[PDB]
Amino acid sequence: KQTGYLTIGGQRYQAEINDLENLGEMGSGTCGQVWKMRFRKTGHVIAVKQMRRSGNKEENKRILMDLDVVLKSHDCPYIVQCFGTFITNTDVFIAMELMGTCAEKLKKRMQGPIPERILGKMTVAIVKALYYLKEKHGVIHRDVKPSNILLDERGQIKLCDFGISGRLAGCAAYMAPERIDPPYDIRADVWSLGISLVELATGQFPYKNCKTDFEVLTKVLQEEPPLLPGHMGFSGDFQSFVKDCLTKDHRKRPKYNKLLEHSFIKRYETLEVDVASWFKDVMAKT
Numbered sequence: 001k002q003t004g005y006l007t008i009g010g011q012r013y014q015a016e017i018n019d020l021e022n023l024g025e026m027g028s029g030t031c032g033q034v035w036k037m038r039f040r041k042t043g044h045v046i047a048v049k050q051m052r053r054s055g056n057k058e059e060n061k062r063i064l065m066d067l068d069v070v071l072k073s074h075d076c077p078y079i080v081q082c083f084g085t086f087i088t089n090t091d092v093f094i095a096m097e098l099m100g101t102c103a104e105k106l107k108k109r110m111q112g113p114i115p116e117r118i119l120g121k122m123t124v125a126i127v128k129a130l131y132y133l134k135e136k137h138g139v140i141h142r143d144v145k146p147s148n149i150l151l152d153e154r155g156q157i158k159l160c161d162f163g164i165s166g167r168l169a170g171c172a173a174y175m176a177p178e179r180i181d182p183p184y185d186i187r188a189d190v191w192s193l194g195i196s197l198v199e200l201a202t203g204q205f206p207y208k209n210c211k212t213d214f215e216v217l218t219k220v221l222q223e224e225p226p227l228l229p230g231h232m233g234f235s236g237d238f239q240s241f242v243k244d245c246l247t248k249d250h251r252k253r254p255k256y257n258k259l260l261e262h263s264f265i266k267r268y269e270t271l272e273v274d275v276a277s278w279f280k281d282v283m284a285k286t
Ligand SMILES: *CCC(=O)N1CCC[C@@H](n2nc(-c3cnc4[nH]ccc4c3)c3c(N)ncnc32)C1
Pocket: 026, 027, 028, 029, 030, 034, 047, 048, 049, 066, 080, 094, 095, 096, 097, 098, 099, 100, 101, 102, 103, 104, 105, 147, 148, 150, 160, 161
């Protein structure tokens, strides 16, 4: 409702675009251009997305859509938080908390499987964020995948990027069977979450031998659901949870309310996992 303000933590600072120094771009254009910037008044370093008024019409619709969800989700601790906005005659700047890395780049830096104790805390955060979006807003994400799961140096794990979210098409590799072949898609992000967990738990994407998008959709419908390997020491609860996410018939796929009662969730809802120190170790490679 208000622009021209930054609220780092619990402190409000009147701010304009010229009060921030550009520390370079964070390379990708998933939604729009994202800059890493420094608040010269306090020294904090933040992420700012620049939306030009002359930019692509389709791209700007998604950037505003994503901002609409983020502003409404201010009270969800598993969703990324907007720090403020600046509106000029030619651009809109969206300030946001600076996270460390996404789960995709973490897998690339690790060059191998990601431990179960990290994926447990990630599962709890992603399930509760989706559950929050359905219940408090009737919004489904429609694009759950490791590149939209962010982690930071303090160990926080948060969902981001709601540019194609719906209020009741994503990447073909993570699309649920019913999204590919509709009979609805209320339980479709659950399938994407299970595909993402199998990928991070093994370091290998389950459909990695496909050369076109359509071939991936064919293997999703024709093959059995990709299982969690049984000789990597994974606990019975981790295997049981992924099997439930990856039910092929969406009618039999469990609900968010039922998934939040799984023994895999109850375990990591209360366990003390030092994901902050495990993060600093991965970031200190290569
Ligand atoms: C694998 C993750 C990745 O490479 N990303 C693409 C480049 C930018 C990375 N990133 N994006 C944001 C972000 C998300 N949503 C927004 N709405 C308004 C402003 C933003 C910014 C990031 C933040 N906040 N911190 C760290 N990295 C970020 C994702």
